[PDB]
Structure formats: structure tokens, C-alpha cells
Amino acid sequence: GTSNRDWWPNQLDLSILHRHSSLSDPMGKDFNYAQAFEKLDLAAVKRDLHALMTTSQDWWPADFGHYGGLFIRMAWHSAGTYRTADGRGGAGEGQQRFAPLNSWPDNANLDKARRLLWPIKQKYGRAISWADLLILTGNVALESMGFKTFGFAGGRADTWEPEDVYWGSEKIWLELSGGPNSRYSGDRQLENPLAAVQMGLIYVNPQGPDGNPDPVAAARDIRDTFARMAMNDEETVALIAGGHTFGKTHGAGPASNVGAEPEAAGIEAQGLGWKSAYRTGKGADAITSGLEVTWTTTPTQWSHNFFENLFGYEWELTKSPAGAHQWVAKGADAVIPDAFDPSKKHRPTMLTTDLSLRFDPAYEKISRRFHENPEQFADAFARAWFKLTHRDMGPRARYLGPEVPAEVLLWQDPIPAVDHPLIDAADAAELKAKVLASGLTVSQLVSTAWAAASTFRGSDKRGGANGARIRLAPQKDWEANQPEQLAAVLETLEAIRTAFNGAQRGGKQVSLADLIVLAGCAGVEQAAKNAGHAVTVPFAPGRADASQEQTDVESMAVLEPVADGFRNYLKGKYRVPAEVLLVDKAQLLTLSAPEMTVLLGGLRVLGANVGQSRHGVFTAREQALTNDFFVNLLDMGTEWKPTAADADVFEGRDRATGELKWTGTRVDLVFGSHSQLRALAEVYGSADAQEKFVRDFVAVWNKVMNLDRFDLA
Amino acid sequence: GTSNRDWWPNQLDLSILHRHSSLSDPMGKDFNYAQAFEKLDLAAVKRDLHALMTTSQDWWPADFGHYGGLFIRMAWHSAGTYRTADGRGGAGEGQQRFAPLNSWPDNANLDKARRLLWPIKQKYGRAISWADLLILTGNVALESMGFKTFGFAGGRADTWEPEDVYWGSEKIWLELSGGPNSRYSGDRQLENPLAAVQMGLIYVNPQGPDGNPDPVAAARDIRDTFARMAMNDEETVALIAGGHTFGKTHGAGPASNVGAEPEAAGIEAQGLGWKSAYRTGKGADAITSGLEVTWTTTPTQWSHNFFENLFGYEWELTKSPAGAHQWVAKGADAVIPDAFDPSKKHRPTMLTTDLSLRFDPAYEKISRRFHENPEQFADAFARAWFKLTHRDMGPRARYLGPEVPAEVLLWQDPIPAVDHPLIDAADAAELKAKVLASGLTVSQLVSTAWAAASTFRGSDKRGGANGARIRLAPQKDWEANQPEQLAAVLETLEAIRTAFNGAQRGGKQVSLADLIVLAGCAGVEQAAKNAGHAVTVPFAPGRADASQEQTDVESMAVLEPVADGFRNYLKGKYRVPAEVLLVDKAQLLTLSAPEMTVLLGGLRVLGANVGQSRHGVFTAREQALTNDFFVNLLDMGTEWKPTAADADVFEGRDRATGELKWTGTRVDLVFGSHSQLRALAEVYGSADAQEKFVRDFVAVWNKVMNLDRFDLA
Ligand code: HEM
Ligand code: HEM
Ligand SMILES: [Cl-]
């Protein structure tokens, strides 16, 4: 059946904004996963998981009698899709069980691992999500094998459909770089927001870059992709060596024996895939990656044998039974156990990417320290494993259950506890009046609170106004935030804060994070009053202020808005049309298409544009909250043409006289072009809509102010 | 950006079941369009529309000074996408304003018509939908030009995104027949459910079949496509000749002058398309279809001149200025007015498809009768226009406003008024007890009520249990309905009804339509009791019994389920996989994916399958309402293989013993295969879910029972 995407393959796609509707969710409207999980008997789940580790199923027999390596791999891949650039991927939504991840070549035979878990998922039902269970299973694997983990938080609610993520443009699984849809350009520069070297891989190719088995050049790919997953060199070595302390790879015969991935398999496969024609197709004969490597002498027990072997032997190149490049210690005795035959032993083997940890000079220093000090290795690995598997879980306030680690980590963008009474409604009213009396304008107030709150992204639940990090490095100097205007606003607000707090009794004080938000509320209230309407914008106190020392500046860089259509801002010139970047930003802000539409048309007339640009300011009463944007955008009396100077800026002229009325960008004019967006703009641009517009504006404004407020959840 | 549809183009698509979520709807959850419309001042709207008719705008000047022709065309195209095979298309959702219809070649320049109506839409806002306004504007055009309409009903709520409709498989707009994706095969047999001859046409090609200007062969296409749109010969001739009493076509220069359709046009085009480089690009120079025909001597006034000209002249083949085939009157004087120059006149002209009305023998007899009896023509066209524009609106209970015609029409599938007191709760308890005492089984009761209620389709809102049409021709004889079993159930229920009604006082009686549904409720209650649960199923009385003379048997045929996965029924072999047919039926029933899931798993264990098939009856307690379907479908102890005899039937065998446990179809096993469906099935198949399953089952059962209950809405 031919579809709209077939006829108009470049039209903007809005369906990303209406994923995750109540229609696709089996749970009731009022289901609260946190409440369910808080009553789980986590200890009982962990006992069942422990027993599972050594209870082999004949349809996928356990290597060495123990599923722990499989399950660590499973949990690492669940977490390993994460990209810092947009926060997408990661374990936090259990997306490994949906397309396309459930069928990525790097996730081969993890469909077996998930299926092994069904009896436990079934037993506990809605009290443990799949997302939580994949991570918990990896922790219990670790623990069962003698490794002390750093802790565990629950609270990853399940999702019910695929997320829309850009994973690349290649049309062939695993395509080597340099093709028509190459993710590389220049001197091996991977395109943002991608964090893997080939389509369908987690990070790197285990044989080496595009299959070339050079440990030195592989190290460059590891470093780059791990950095794009928020891990530095120490964390990267710890994670790779830690994980390869356990289990084995699977490459017993040629890869051509392996059949269709799950999404392509027949219905009788019942959601499994990669059925293999090689011998028994499983167990001793398993084929997963096509490598055949077993790292340590005790693959079911924590040890420091990975680095003993890596440093203790000299390595030579060889091929697995499927023909993949890997390495063997030919000088070694046969000390590595066989997974099924107690009468066989094997020499040590390593991947090309393992040898990277010894032959890249920076890695070698770290690997040597871990080798000589395996207690340092074990702490670094525990910490990095916790970070890997919680990186996309959001603020610590989301963490559930009895094993949450008490240590506060810099990467968590931590918010100090509030130890004092909060402002009440009367206090908030007094502060709103003081802000408006200071001389700060509607535009200043709205722009500042927007800048503070709109760094939130729901992909990894980082960002938002909590912390008052707008006042700190680097947010204070981001171009989108108008650093000299911002500095003057914050000085005024800080003076108001000092005066209020100095006048109080009995410990009551307001944070600057709360005041920035409250002051934006006052701006919105004043804008409505400018338009002849009395409204109260809701405000919830309880944000706290983080310090510069509690703020990782380099980690915060990926939150910088380089495109913010809601402020008509584009930091430079991108291949991606600006209207596409708008929808992407709306998706990160968790906005539907109606909410995006109302919010943008109101921000335009409140004076939120960077630089005070006139683009899209389709009103003669700027700083009044009206539906002017929509009424004037939709007026057929105005004709629109791209300017000679810039094809992405448009002039709106009176159709009869030629008189210049307005200018606008693609972000502005898409609302008059796109057939779904224009239908929305019509609702808000109708003569009966002034009350609706104001109410819907205030509701979406409040939603944005509260995106990071999981303390109130 | 590579998507799941790219990697797995044949995987089942569930997004169709989650269109139209509250996420995409700008109106609040509680907006009630019927209530808004009821308060509109329709008379004020109609005065505005009358004024618009001759208010010419320079960007699209009115032909002859009057937009009426353009607007009748616009309304005829809004309604003209309708197909009886599935009920999809039609005017009832205002889909003309969204892709792909807004950009179909046959809808060229209707983007201008819709834009002319923005100021009226804007003025009245939410109280008049676009869907209603398109139809209203066509009525006003008719009225304005001297034609008295049969009436008008409001009530078509707006929608906010494209419907998913199969419009064909061609990848080229307007592709002629016999291509790789041909919609024709055999002896010009058009594939169901399609009702147009080429992709992007409303019905037929105005030049003739595949462009061949043969009025006789064109007549064959007209008859077939119009019958696929629920119109017989009399209605077809009345509509074409009525419509072409007005206005003109547009073909002033070569079609190569006309630019991108709306969905492909530049952002500066602000939602319009087909910009033309020919002279002024508009008005006297307009190009729409490429034909240049004006039918009558008074194109802005109702007349009898269409049939005078059709019969009064002999016709010669000629070419328009764009090169299209059309016809000109031999020897005629220049009597037809020019649209813009009062000093020019033109000879009568006709389309190939107009000449069909004279040269097809059956049409000629009707056209002659209308020529000789123009009052008969006027009444037939009025009646047909009402039917055209209301065919997809559903029961008369949905019709709103002061111009609804009182006459009840056979095509409306009419339901007699209720003139008596309804049964109360005590009476319903008494009847349920009589039903369960009769010996009728759970399977009988559930199957009968399912058969009665599941004929509903939300595309055109036909069907459903109101009317008790299951007892009439043709529903009583449909194979899916198990005619012999059904007859024995109905006999028993009709005896219960007669006895109850005979014992009443004061006019109280129960209809058989209500009793059928109440008896199904009793079956579900009994099934719950069988499973050890205390459940009460909701029941709302007030259905009435329609007569055979109120039930057009030929129109009812299109409602026959030839595939009903809910009963594991497939009438024959289709190209389309059975699971795809299931999702299609769930969409017609207005179900989401969770609702489809719960409903099918419950129906299986209640004994709803046609023929008492054991396919998918994964329980050892048939006729008990449990979640056995899900728990047993998801048991990894069972292995599934297609049978040697039929690849679409599967055996489930104990994996260790080889013993046969179950059989299933594709409909059954898709719930264990498709990654989104299996996630749903896992919720219902978990140890904590028996209560949720029962409660969600009873809710979706009741939803299905009430689909046509617009008397309660
Ligand atoms: C440069 C990064 C990495 C590469 C290229 C890599 C590559 C692979 C490959 C090719 C296998 C074999 C899959 C199979 O054939 O069964 C695998 C196995 C495994 N990997 Fe990694 N890996 C990386 C990092 C990780 C990390 C960060 C962890 C966890 C902290 C991890 C843990 C595991 C485990 C436990 C297995 C064994 C699976 C089993 O016993 O069934 N790896 N790795
Ligand atoms: C065999 C079925 C039909 C065919 C092939 C047909 C074809 C066409 C075409 C080619 C045009 C010219 C479009 C343009 O260039 O602007 C048109 C115009 C029009 N048609 Fe039809 N038509 C059909 C049925 C109908 C019906 C059922 C109605 C209404 C009851 C209708 C009402 C009109 C009107 C009023 C116009 C004039 C538009 C104007 O003045 O701008 N037609 N038709
Ligand atoms: Cl994601």
C-alpha cells in the first residue's frame, strides 16, 4: 500500500510526538510503576535470579553450567546504546525487547537471554519492569560470581513501543565505512549523534576498524565511541576488562549457518531468531558473533586473570572457525576450560579490541595499574558498571528500592537536599510582585526562565531548571542564553532573593532556582494582564541550587541548545532543515504537536527570541499574551517570499499593496505550511480561541517548568 | 534515517490502531463537538456562505463572478472518496485537508476553495468543523444558484491527522492500468476495496478508460466505481448531470505549466499548491484538470440545459488547449458564456464521461426520462446529493441541527423509534436468569452476541447490534455467523422474549436486539462464575428491532466478515496475511492494540471460534473466563511448527516429550511473535493479571456491544 512517506519522503514527520499514547499502553491511566516496584520483594527476585544462573534450559544450554556471562552481556548491551549527544538509547526504557534493537546483529542470541527471564517476569508481573529486570539480572550475575556491585536502583518504567531514534542512514546491516551513507567523514570523524562505528553494533567492531585487526587503530574507535557514551579512559578500561573477566564468545562454525534475526523470523519462532543450522545450533555449537574466545581460566568467577593473561603472554593473530580475526597466546599451556567438555582445555585467546587495552599507550598505563592493583580494578569496574546502567535514569529522586548507593556522584548532576521550610502561596505572590516592581520586563523574565528550564531532555532526563545551573559554567556563557542579558537578570533576581531571605523567620528561604522559575511565572502573568486577562500561573517550590564544584562542565556541554526553534535560534548552518530540529527539540521536551504549537506561538509574542529578532513576532503588542501569532500567520492577506539574501528567511508582504508586514524563518512558517501543523494553528487562530490559547499556554509553560521535578512525582 | 519499516517491510503495522490519540488532538479530553455545533447559529453561517459566493478574491478569481461551481466540486470530492467495501473515505472526517487527499491530482485547486473558507471557519471556530463546513458550503452553493436541497445534518467532528487507508499500490500518480501494481486484472476487474480507476482519481478518468475517449466503455467504469460508492444507475445519472449543470472545467494551457502539489510545494506557498506559470496562473488562465468544458448556458444557475445540450446536439471529438480529449457540439452556435470576458461566447462542450449518460443504453433511458421530466431529475439529484454527502455519517441519531430531513431513507439502515418503557435492572436480572435456565451455553451466548455486535465499523458507522439484523436476510445466512447454530439460539431467545413481553404491564417490552446483547452479557457472567469470579457486565437497554423492509440486503453485503480473527475465521484464501486482516478488523471496531489483545484471548477461551475449532483454545477449561490463552501461548515449554498439510496452521508440542498440546493459526500465534503484541500478551499472562484480564475483558466486551449506541452518546 503506497503511503504519505512514499509520496512525500521529505515532508516533516510528527508521529514521533505522539508515540507512547494511552492507546498503546496496556496498563490503566492511573498505574504507577514506582508504587508497584516499592512493594516488590526485591530480595526474593534476586534469589530467583541467583538460582536461574545455574539452571540450564536445553533449548539454549548454559556455558560452563552458568548463564552469568550471557546476562552481563545482555545488561551491558541494554545500557550500551546510550549516546550523550541526545541522551537517546540506554537501558532506561527496556527498548532491547522492541525493534530494531531486538534484532541488531550485536544483540544476537540476547533473545535467548530475555526468554530465560520470562518465568521470573511472569511471577512478579507489573511489580518489576523488563527495563529494571535486565539490569537487575546483570547485577545478580556479577554477584553470583563473586563480584561486589556498587548498588542498584529500580524505577525504569516499561514502554510499549519502539522509540524513534536515528541510528544512522545505512541500508545494509554492518556496512563498512565509506559507503553512500557513510557515518564517517574527514579523518575518521563519526557523525553526531551516533556513537557506534557500524549500523547494528553497540560500540566498535571486535575484529578492528572495518575488520582490520590492528589493536592500536581499534583503540581510537573505542575511545571515540566510549566518549560518546559518557565514559572516559579509566571507565572504558575498567568496563571492557571487567566484562571480559566472564564468559566467552560464540563462533563454532561459519556464519552462513545463522538464519533470520527475530523481526524477520517465521511466526513459529515465537519471537526468537538466529536459528543456526550448524550442528546442534546451540551450546557447544553456538554461533553469535563468529569469534571463539574464552578470556579466563575461571569464566564463572570474578578474578584478575584477564589482565594476568593480557600482560603475561605474547599474542599472535589467528582465525576462529567462522573465519574471524582474533588472537592466541601460542606459548601458553592449555589452561582455559571448555564450556561443555570437561576433558578439553584451550589456550588463552583475546579480541583485537582487548589487545587495545595493552597496546594503546594511554590504555596501557591504566591497564597496568589495574593489573598490579586488582582492588583498584574492582572498584573502578563497580563504579563504571553502576554509571553505565543508571546513566539515563535521571535525577536521584527517581531511584527506587533498598540498594541505592548513598554516595552522590558528580555525573548525576546532583541537587543538594532542601533542609528548610518552603515559600507558600502568599510568599510566591509577594515575590512575583517584587520581581515585576524591579523593572525586569516580560521578555527578560520569560527568556530567562525558558533558558533555565528548556535544557531538560526526556531521553536521559538530564537538564531542567532544578539546580540553578544557568548561573554557572558553562550554561551562563552559552550563546543561546544571551550571556550579558542573562547576567543582568540574574543580578537583579539575586538581589531580590537576598532581601527576601534576610527578612524571614524560622529558616524559610527561597532558592535562586525557584526564583528564576517564579519570575518567569510572573512574566507570563504580566503578559496576560497586558492583554487584558487576569491569570495565575501555577508554581511549585522546592528546587535547590547546585554549586560549581557539583557541576561537571564537560558533561554539561552536550546539553547546549545549538538549535532552539522556540527561541528562533540556530547556532550555525546545518544540513537538517530547522523545522526538523524543532520537532526533535519538542520530542526531547516531551511535548505533543499541539503543545509545541501553542508554546511557540506564545513565546514569539512574549519576546523570547534570541537577540530580540523580529522573526516570527507577528504582533503589534509584543509582551502581551495573545494568539496574534496564529491570526497573523494565517491571514491570506499576506504573501510570503524567501529573501534574496537568505533563502531561509521570508518576507510577508500585504498582497494588495506590497507593503512589508513581517519577517519569519522556516520554524515560523512551517505552521502555515505543514498540513497537520496548520490545522493546529487554525484552532488557536480562531475567533473563539483567546481563552483556550491562554489556558493551553499556561499549562504547557508550567509543564516545561516542572519537567525535572521528580521530587513531586 | 533508516526505520523499522525499511529493515522489515513486511512486519505487521500496529500504528494504525493508535491514530487519533489524545496526544495529537488539540481539543481538551472533554470537548464535545455535538454540543458545540448545537449551539452554532447555522443560519448566520449560511448567510456568510451566501455572501462568500460572489466575493471574488484576486489570488483565485471566481468564474462568472460566482464560486458555486468550485464549491460543489469541492463538496462532491470530499464525499467522493467513499468506498462501500470498507466504509473508509467519505466526507465525514474532513480528510480532504490532510495528506494524501489534499494533494491528489483530482483535488487540484480545491486547496484554493478550502482557503476561501478560512475566514468563515475562523469566525465560528470550534462550533463548525471543517468536515461539516465543506458539505454545508456545497449545499449553500446549490441553494445560491437556485437549487433546493433535501436538507443537511451537522455532526462530522474534525480529525487531526491522516487516516491510514489503502488507496492502491501504484507508485506513480495516475498510473494507467496493467502496470506492476495494477489495480485491474482480468476483464477490467477492479481490486477490492478500491473504488477509483487510477491512483489520485475520485472515480473515473474524464477522458475515458485509461485515457481512451470511448463514452460506452467509460460508462462501464462509471457504473462500477459509483456502485462501489453505494450509488445505483438512477442516482449516478442524477449526480453527474446535476453537478455538471454548474460551473466549468479548467484547461487553458499545457499541464506542464502547473507546479508542485501542496505536500511537495515550498514553505512559502503556505499550504497551497499547483502554482501555474501559464499567463496569470488563475482565473481565465486556470489549469486544473486540463479539460476546457462549460456545460450550460447559465453556469451559475440551476437549469434543464445539461440534458437539452446532451441530446440536442451531435458530438465531435476534439482536444482542449492542454491536449486532453473532450467533445464539441457539431454545428452549434456560440451560446455558452465565457467565465471572464462578456464579449466571448463558446460552443457547447462535454466530457467523454458526460456522453456516457447518452450512449450507454441503460443510462440513456434514465437521462431521457430526466430530460422529459425535469422535476423528476431535480428530486433525484436532491436525494442523491444528500445521500452522497451523508452516506458515512452513521445512524440518524448522529444527525444534528435544524435542517435534518424528517424522511427516513432505506440507505440509512434505519432503526424504529422506541415508543415504550425500557427494561430496568430487575428485569435484566430476571431475563439473564431465564437465558441461563434455557440451556443455552456460554459459547452459544457469547458467539451470538459477538456476531450481532461486531458488524459495526467506525469508518462509516454502519453495522452493530442495534436493529437485530442478525435475524434477517442476509446476516442470518452469513457463514461466519454459523446459520444453523444461530437459528436455534434465536428461536430460544425469541421464545424468552415473547414470554417476558406477554407478562408485562403498561407497555413495557424488551426488543430482540437488546435481548441478544443481554444474553451475551449473561454468558460472559456465567463464564466468570465458571472461573470462580463474581463479575457484573454492564448492559444498556434501548435497541429496537428493524424490519426486513428496513434492511437493504444488497447494501448489507458489504458488511459480511470474510475475515474475523476474533472468531478465527477466514472465508477463503487472501493474499493479505491473516494477522494483517485481524489488525484491519480491530481498526474498524475502533480497538487499540491492548483492547484487541484482551478481547481475542478472552473470546478464544469462551468458545467464540466458528465451527467450534480448537485453534487457539489454549485452555483446559473452555467456557471459563480466564487468562489461560496468554499464560499458555507464552509457555516456552511448548514448541511450535507449521503443519505439513497447511503452512498456516501450527502445532504446539511439549518440547521435551513431543506430545501434542495445542493447535493454532497465524492469528493466534502472532501474539507470541510480533514484539509489540507479545509485550501486551505478557502483561495479561503474568501471575498478577487474572483480575486485570477479567476487568479489561468486560470493558472491551461492553465497548463492542455499545459501538452503534449513538442514542446514548
Ligand atoms: C570495546 C568494547 C567491547 C567489544 C568490542 C566487545 C565485544 C564482544 C563480543 C564480540 C562478544 C562475543 C559475543 C558472542 O559471540 O557471544 C562479547 C562478549 C561479552 N562481552 Fe564484550 N565487548 C565490549 C565491551 C563489553 C563491556 C563493556 C562488557 C560489560 C561490562 C562486556 C561484557 C561481555 C560479556 C560478559 C561477554 C560474554 C558473553 C557470554 O558469556 O555469553 N563487553 N563482547
Ligand atoms: C463520472 C463522474 C465525474 C467525472 C469524471 C467528473 C469530472 C470532472 C472534471 C474533469 C471537472 C473539471 C475540474 C477542473 O478542471 O476544474 C469537473 C468539474 C465539476 N464537477 Fe464533475 N465529474 C464527475 C462527477 C461529478 C459529480 C457527481 C458532481 C456533483 C454532484 C460534480 C460536480 C462538478 C462541478 C460542479 C464541477 C465544476 C467545478 C467548477 O466550476 O470549478 N461532478 N468534473
Ligand atoms: Cl531511545
Ligand SMILES: [Cl-]
Ligand atoms: Cl478515511
Ligand code: NA
Ligand atoms: Na535514553
Ligand code: NA
Ligand atoms: Na469513512
